[PDB]
Amino acid sequence: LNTPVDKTSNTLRVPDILALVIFAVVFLVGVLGNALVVWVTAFEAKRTINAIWFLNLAVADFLSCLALPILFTSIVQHHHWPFGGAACSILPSLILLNMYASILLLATISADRFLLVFKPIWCQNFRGAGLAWIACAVAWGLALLLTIPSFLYRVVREEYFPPKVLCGVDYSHDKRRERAVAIVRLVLGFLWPLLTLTICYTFILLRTWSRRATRSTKTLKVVVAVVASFFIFWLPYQVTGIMMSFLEPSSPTFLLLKKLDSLCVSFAYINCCINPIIYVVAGQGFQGRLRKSL
Amino acid sequence: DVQLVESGGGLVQPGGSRKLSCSASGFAFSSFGMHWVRQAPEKGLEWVAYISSGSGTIYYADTVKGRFTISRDDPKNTLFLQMTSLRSEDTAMYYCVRSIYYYGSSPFDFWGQGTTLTVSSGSDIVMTQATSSVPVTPGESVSISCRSSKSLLHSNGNTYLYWFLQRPGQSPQLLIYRMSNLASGVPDRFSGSGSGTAFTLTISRLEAEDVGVYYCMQHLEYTFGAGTKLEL
Amino acid sequence: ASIAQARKLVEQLKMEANIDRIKVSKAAADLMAYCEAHAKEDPLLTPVPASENPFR
Amino acid sequence: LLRQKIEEQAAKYKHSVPKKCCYDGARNFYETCEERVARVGPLCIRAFNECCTIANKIRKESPHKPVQLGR
Amino acid sequence: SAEERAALERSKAIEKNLKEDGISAAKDVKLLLLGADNSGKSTIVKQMKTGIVETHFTFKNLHFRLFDVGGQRSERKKWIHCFEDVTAIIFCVDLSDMHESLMLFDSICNNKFFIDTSIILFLNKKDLFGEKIKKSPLTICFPEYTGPNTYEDAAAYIQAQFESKNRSPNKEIYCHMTCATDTNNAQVIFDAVTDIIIANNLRGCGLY
Amino acid sequence: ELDQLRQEAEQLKNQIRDARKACADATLSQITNNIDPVGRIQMRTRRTLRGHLAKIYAMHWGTDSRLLVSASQDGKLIIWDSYTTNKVHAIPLRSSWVMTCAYAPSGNYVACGGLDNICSIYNLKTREGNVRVSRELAGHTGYLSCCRFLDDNQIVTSSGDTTCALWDIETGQQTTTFTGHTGDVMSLSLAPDTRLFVSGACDASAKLWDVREGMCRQTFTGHESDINAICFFPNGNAFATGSDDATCRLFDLRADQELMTYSHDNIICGITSVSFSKSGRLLLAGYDDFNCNVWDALKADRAGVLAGHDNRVSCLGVTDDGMAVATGSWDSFLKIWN
């Protein structure tokens, strides 16, 4: 009763614990795993054109995995922001750069896989480090364009009741700008990538099974393991984001959305965990290439 | 049949510009470097330019750095020197030389016949010669020497000093490369030797064709000494 | 017939037969002798100093 | 520029308990004022509500969203 | 480094030229044309228009390197390893025989190096085969053949007999009968090579 | 009579074996008890010459102990510098199926050949500045399997049509031909004195010719399968061989019989090339097991293993100065081991 503890307190309970453990396991598989994939594609490869794509995807996922300690600290410090205002304007832009680099790299990988199947005689005119690096650079630049609203609008905020200083966004405070950035981000980061994954892999499957001697029945397994994981791991994140941005800053709908965001970002990062494991497992030869890379 | 025919000489008013040209034939131009070594009418040789194979890197002497440029047109097998804002010191006859650099290769094998260039009146390695002239007689023995500001022996074991023979009224030829190795076509009478910083060339069993001026060059980093004339 | 070339093979066999043979002990002795004499002139059998080695 | 507002609102206290009650009243995005006041002094019923509602109406219509830095 | 930096620049240029030659050469496709003697291989290359006679032809933006390795007489075991990593064998068989062709085929498709290489089996000169079956029964060449002497089933039987020598289901044998026709041999070779490069492209990306 | 000479041919065969067995009063395996072994030879990759893209079939050290020549399916006969790693030449070949490459003892000439039945000899010191074909040595009917330079003017060739030949490069005529093999002649090793040379062939028989006349002098038949590799002992009185037998054997030119068999139960991959160290104490053999084993030529026990290739170790060779040992591979990575 007569204690410094008031009527309410907020410890580290709540399924924020689940988000915490998910971030922990993703960090474990990012320090290991993901880190090896980028190495073997660079030093022992990348004279082969097909290694360029997975090099860039692995490095984007790795840079996303370097942001795991900061997300962990933000979760455990109840969104306290120890860094500076310039950090609030820069670092979130970089983490979104890594996220959307991963996503558009998946889309470009799928487009290249489609081109490898539907235009093979044209592929042995086009293929080279030039086109692969051009496409990967375009993907990274698109990630930069998608994140430049974060590089612009993010500012630090402060409340003075506790010292819980936090980082936020200024959408003019009285007018709609959040809707446009939110819808464009949702489209170019989840819908257009999802279409370029699903349609391209479906056509790859259709052409692969039509001709004889190509129906490996492993193409179906790998395509499903990519697209289903992508969908089930990005949809909760992106739909929550768009609903939160469109919905007003009040009402119980926003209450549960703010409750669920942490787990939504955790699910978004499950895809970062899943992207390199599929390559290291399904890639033939790339089990001994890892041991022989040293 | 190796040829290095140069053209573009004549009279240039001071402060003018002129494109010295070197036309090559009988060999794979693209695989060779090029230098545009020049000689004043009353002085020794002086290095001018160096274009690498495939134009990867280029060097100039400090006296023409920025003032003149070199270019190589490999499809036409032609090398150009763009001398700009010429001065009185630029009156000299210019030589176009070959160079292929690899283990066992000989720089400066072939020198073109050269072209005379005239204008009207208006931290470094140096190589010095201990003599300016030496009397000689057929069948006798001669010994020329040179010195440099520092040792020419690199860490890898090579010693990048050269020897060139210029007979009167003729373009020079390579005699000794890396101080010990005979160039192709040079008779075994010539034999270079040395150590540290003092290097010598011997012309034992001198034949009548050995009369001329002998120039010694360092090649450790990006030059000809004064030279000495043997008189019969 | 093939008898001509067959007799050529027989003649080759005779020429091989006329070849002199050394006691294998002496040939082996020569072998070891060469090996121990020249054991000091290779950097593989004897570990080369790092300074004299031209690849390090 | 809102520190003076909450300070001047809290300044009307008459005891330490109302002061700390107002201090903790203006705290949390996951719970509304009505949900938070249910957990709690006779003057706390009024003071908590007024401080929390004043601070809340202060933070809206302002350039701020508690966006998690992973978004 | 001394002026040997010029030698290092020359070496870098040589490495660049090697890379460019590797890229330029890989854009073509290699086809081994191993087959029985006098099986009309010269005909199948002429229609497409002393050692390895590396004849070549290009079809629809794709360049075929068609190595006829039968020009030199030697045991296959000593030089067939040089044709490892060839995309496909253009194996051809003449129907005028014959069991030597079967033995050669059984040696090829089950060979260690070619355990993953497709085979475009050409049945050549089918018209004279029709003439022969009209004049003589097939049992004179295959005693175990139970079918009649009509064209279709005999051709199917011999094609199946060739195909049955496979001992690795991951391979494939694109048997085809040309009957001395024009421009169809090139078409089936092109289709086969397209399938093979698509399969290799899938294998590289990890879809296999 | 035809039958009588065939019977006497066997009658010749057994009595030479009896004489051969008569001189076999002892073997090197028991004589070597008086000397110490060399221990673990831990050779390490001092370099990697990663210029080849496809299966560098054969390599040869220059007399300088500084340069290599390497042949590959890529069609490029590039010649390396062993320290600076530089590619000092890249000769483009007429046919890309080369299993033969040879570096002239003077360093002027490089020759290569293969499934084209033609030996191409390349002049490196041309005044035009680029390596070009000196002469093409047509005259064989099978594939060429090895080339060696006696001097700048005459080259000895081993081919697949069971005949070694000796040419003069001055005019390109087959000045001397050799015969007496049944299988394809696969490897060829000139003696240090350049007055004799042994060749191994597919019939598991190795024999030593004289270069002055087309007469074989002695024959060796220790192996069971095709002689893939052969190399003269440095002293010139002995030589070793390698085959698909997955074992190497050492022969003697004067004892005319096998002296050692370098085998172990754990190795079943055939030999691809062989060459001795400078002193002859050490024998290096490149197995199809994607590695090169180092064999003590006197104790016959395995001195160690050299690894680092992802495919066949198709060629192997120690420098003329004994400085190092380089191993080309089907992985296209020329290792330089010391």
DSSP one-letter string for E66-116: EEEGGGS-S-GGGTGGGGTT-SEE--EEETT--HHHHHHHHHHHT-STTTT
- What are the b/e assignments for F184-215, b being 16+ CB within 10 Å? bbbbbbbbeebebbbbbbbbbbbbbbebeebe
How many Cβ atoms from other residues are within 10 Å of residue E56's Cβ? 14
Q: Where are the alpha helices (DSSP H) in chain B?
A: none
Are A92 and D26 inside 8 Å of each other by CB?
no
Q: Is E23 on the interface with A (CB under 8 A)?
A: yes
> Where are the domains positioned within chain E?
28-203
Q: Measured between CB atoms, which of F53, F114, F117 is closest to E22?
A: F53
Q: Which residue of E has its CA nearest to F98?
A: E82
Measure E73 CA to nearest chain F CA, in Å: 7
Q: Is B131 on the interface with E (CB under 8 A)?
A: no
Cβ(F121)–Cβ(F91) under 8 Å?
Answer: no
Are A7 and D39 inside 8 Å of each other by CB?
yes
- Which of F142, F168, F164 minimizes the C-alpha distance to F155? F168
Q: What sign results for the dihedral spanned by CA atoms F194, F198, F201, F207?
A: positive
Are D30 and A162 inside 8 Å of each other by CB?
no
DSSP letter assigned to residue E138:
G
Q: Which residue of F has its CA nearest to E86?
A: F73
Alpha carbon distance F161, F117 (integer Å) = 10
Q: Which residue of B has its CA nearest to F128?
A: B27
> Where are the domains positioned within chain A?
16-292
Q: Which residue of E has its CA nearest to F51?
A: E15
Measure B100 CA to nearest chain F CA, in Å: 8
Are D23 and A161 inside 8 Å of each other by CB?
yes
What is the location of CATH 2.60.40.10 in chain B? 3-119, 127-231
Q: Measured between CB atoms, which of F53, F75, F184 is closest to E78?
A: F184
Alpha carbon distance F236, F254 (integer Å) = 11
Beta carbons within 8 Å of F266's beta carbon, 6+ residues apart: none
Residue type, F167: W
Range of the structural domain that residue F234 is part of? 1-338
H or E segment at A10? none
Residue A59 sits at φ, ψ, to 5 deg, of -70, -35
Q: Which residue of E has its CA nearest to F83?
A: E8
Burial of C40 (0-12, 13-18, 19+ CB in 10 A): exposed
Measure F5 CA to nearest chain C CA, in Å: 7
Cross-sheet strand order for the sheet of F109-114: F98-103, F109-114, F119-123, F132-137
How many Cβ atoms from other residues are within 10 Å of residue A200's Cβ? 22
CATH of the domain at F224: 2.130.10.10
Alpha carbon distance E79, F228 (integer Å) = 13
Q: Measured between CB atoms, which of C7, C25, C42 is closest to F5?
A: C7
Cβ(F315)–Cβ(F102) under 8 Å?
Answer: no
Mode of pairing for the β-strands spanning F45-49 and F334-337: antiparallel
**Long-range contacts of residues F327-330, Cβ cutoff 8 Å, at least 24 apart:** F327/F286, F327/F292, F328/F52, F328/F56, F328/F57, F328/F58, F328/F59, F328/F70, F329/F55, F329/F56, F329/F290, F330/F55, F330/F56
Alpha carbon distance E94, E98 (integer Å) = 8
For domain B127-231, give the CATH superfamily.
Answer: Immunoglobulins (2.60.40.10)
Alpha carbon distance F220, F260 (integer Å) = 13
Cβ(F61)–Cβ(F68) under 8 Å?
Answer: yes
Measure E81 CA to nearest chain A CA, in Å: 22
What's chain B's Rg over C-alpha atoms? Answer: 18
For chain F, what is the domain count?
1
Helix, strand, coil tally for chain E in percent (to 5): 50, 15, 35
Helix axes A50-65, A35-42, angle to 10 degrees: 150
Residue B89 sits at φ, ψ, to 5 deg, of -70, -15
Residue type, B149: S
Task: Write the CA distances from E126 to B104, E95, E97, E103, E122, integer angstroms.
Answer: 62, 7, 12, 21, 10
User: Locate tokens 């497709």: which residue?
Assistant: E118
Alpha carbon distance F100, F56 (integer Å) = 11
CATH 1.10.1040.10 fits B3-119, yes or no: no
Chain F, residues 55-84, CB within 8 A of chain C, namely: 82-83
Task: Write the CA distances from A37 to A44, A106, A275, B5, integer angstroms.
Answer: 11, 15, 10, 58
Angle at the Cα of E76 from the Cα atoms of E70 and E81, rounded to 5 degrees: 105
Tell me the fold of D3-59. Answer: Influenza Virus Matrix Protein; Chain A, domain 1 (1.20.91)
Q: Is F38 on the interface with C (CB under 8 A)?
A: yes
Measure E72 CA to nearest chain A CA, in Å: 32
Alpha carbon distance D18, D25 (integer Å) = 10
Cβ(E31)–Cβ(E87) under 8 Å?
Answer: yes
Measure E61 CA to nearest chain B CA, in Å: 29
Alpha carbon distance F282, D65 (integer Å) = 77
Q: Which residue of F has its CA nearest to E10?
A: F88
Structure token pair of residue F113: 């050949």
Alpha carbon distance B44, F230 (integer Å) = 59
Q: If DSSP codes are grouped into helix, strand and coil, which group holds residue F124?
A: coil
Range of the structural domain that residue C44 is part of? 3-55
Task: Write the CA distances from B198 to B129, B141, B193, D57, integer angstroms.
Answer: 10, 20, 9, 92
Alpha carbon distance F231, F61 (integer Å) = 14
Beta carbons within 8 Å of F185's beta carbon, 6+ residues apart: F145, F146, F158, F159, F160, F162, F163, F164, F199, F200, F201, F202
Task: Write the CA distances from F157 to B69, F200, F308, integer angstroms.
Answer: 52, 12, 31
Cβ(F74)–Cβ(F63) under 8 Å?
Answer: no
Q: Is A50 on the interface with E (CB under 8 A)?
A: yes
H or E segment at E159? helix E151-163
CATH of the domain at C37: 4.10.260.10
Measure F61 CA to nearest chain C CA, in Å: 15
Contacts of F89 in chain B (CB under 8 A): 102
How many pairs of residues across A and D have Cβ atoms under 8 Å apart? 88
In chain B, the largest separation of any two C-alpha atoms, in whole Å, equals 50
Interface test with A, best of D2, D40, D64, D69 (most A CBs within 10 A): D69
Mode of pairing for the β-strands spanning E28-32 and E88-89: parallel
Residue E125 sits at φ, ψ, to 5 deg, of 55, 55
- What are the b/e assignments for A14-50, b being 16+ CB within 10 Å? eebeebbebbeebbebbeebbbebbbbbeebbbeebb
Which residues is chain B interrupted after (C–N above 2.5 Å)? 122, 222
CA D2 to chain CA mean position, Å = 12
Alpha carbon distance F87, F50 (integer Å) = 10
- What are the b/e assignments for D2-35, b being 16+ CB within 10 Å? eeeebeebbeebeeeebebbbbbbbbeeebbbee
Query: Would you say how long chain C is, in residues?
Result: 56
H or E segment at D15? none
Q: Which residue of F has its CA nearest to C52?
A: F323
Cβ(E173)–Cβ(E119) under 8 Å?
Answer: yes
CATH class of E28-203: alpha beta
CA F127 to chain CA mean position, Å = 32
Residue type, F265: D
Q: Measured between CB atoms, which of F66, F128, F129 is closest to B103?
A: F66
Q: If DSSP codes are grouped into helix, strand and coil, which group holds residue A69?
A: helix
Task: Write the CA distances from A293 to A290, F284, F309, integer angstroms.
Answer: 5, 26, 12
Contacts of A128 in chain E (CB under 8 A): 23
Query: Domain A16-292 belongs to what architecture?
Result: Up-down Bundle (1.20)
Q: Which residue of E has its CA nearest to F115?
A: E51
Residue E195 sits at φ, ψ, to 5 deg, of -60, -40
Are E195 and A212 inside 8 Å of each other by CB?
yes
Contacts of B103 in chain E (CB under 8 A): 7
- Which of B162, B170, B27 minimizes the C-alpha distance to B93? B170
What's chain A's Rg over C-alpha atoms? Answer: 21
Q: Which residue of F has its CA nearest to E25?
A: F74
Beta carbons within 8 Å of E148's beta carbon, 6+ residues apart: none
Are C55 and F254 inside 8 Å of each other by CB?
no
Q: Residues of E at the F interface (Cβ-Cβ below 8 Å)?
A: 4, 7-8, 10-11, 14-15, 17-18, 21-22, 25, 50-52, 54, 69, 72-75, 78-79, 82, 85
Cβ(E152)–Cβ(E133) under 8 Å?
Answer: no
Residue E102 sits at φ, ψ, to 5 deg, of -60, -45
Are B102 and F86 inside 8 Å of each other by CB?
yes
Beta carbons within 8 Å of A145's beta carbon, 6+ residues apart: none
Contacts of E79 in chain F (CB under 8 A): 115, 143, 160
Query: Would you say how long chain A is, in residues?
Result: 294
Chain E, residues 11-70, CB within 8 A of chain B, namely: 11-13
For chain C, what is the domain count?
1
Cβ(E117)–Cβ(E172) under 8 Å?
Answer: no
State in Å, rounded, how far the first CA of chain B is from the last one.
Answer: 31
Alpha carbon distance A151, D58 (integer Å) = 26
Q: Measured between CB atoms, which of F255, F277, F297 is closest to C22?
A: F255
Structure token pair of residue E126: 């089918």
Structure token pair of residue F170: 């001055």
Cβ(B50)–Cβ(B35) under 8 Å?
Answer: yes
Contacts of E202 in chain A (CB under 8 A): 116-117, 208, 214, 216, 219
Alpha carbon distance C25, C18 (integer Å) = 21
Alpha carbon distance F231, F242 (integer Å) = 9
Q: If DSSP codes are grouped into helix, strand and coil, which group holds residue F154?
A: strand
Cross-sheet strand order for the sheet of F165-168: F144-151, F154-159, F165-168, F176-177
Chains E and F: 3 or more CB pairs within 8 Å of each other: yes
Contacts of A170 in chain D (CB under 8 A): 63-64
Are E2 and B156 inside 8 Å of each other by CB?
yes
- Which of A96, A115, A114, A107 minimizes the C-alpha distance to A138? A107
- Which of F64, F61, F114, F119 minimizes the C-alpha distance to F315? F61
Are E74 and F161 inside 8 Å of each other by CB?
yes
Alpha carbon distance F141, E71 (integer Å) = 10
Measure B26 CA to nearest chain F CA, in Å: 7
User: Locate tokens 């010295």: which residue?
Assistant: B20
Alpha carbon distance A166, A74 (integer Å) = 9
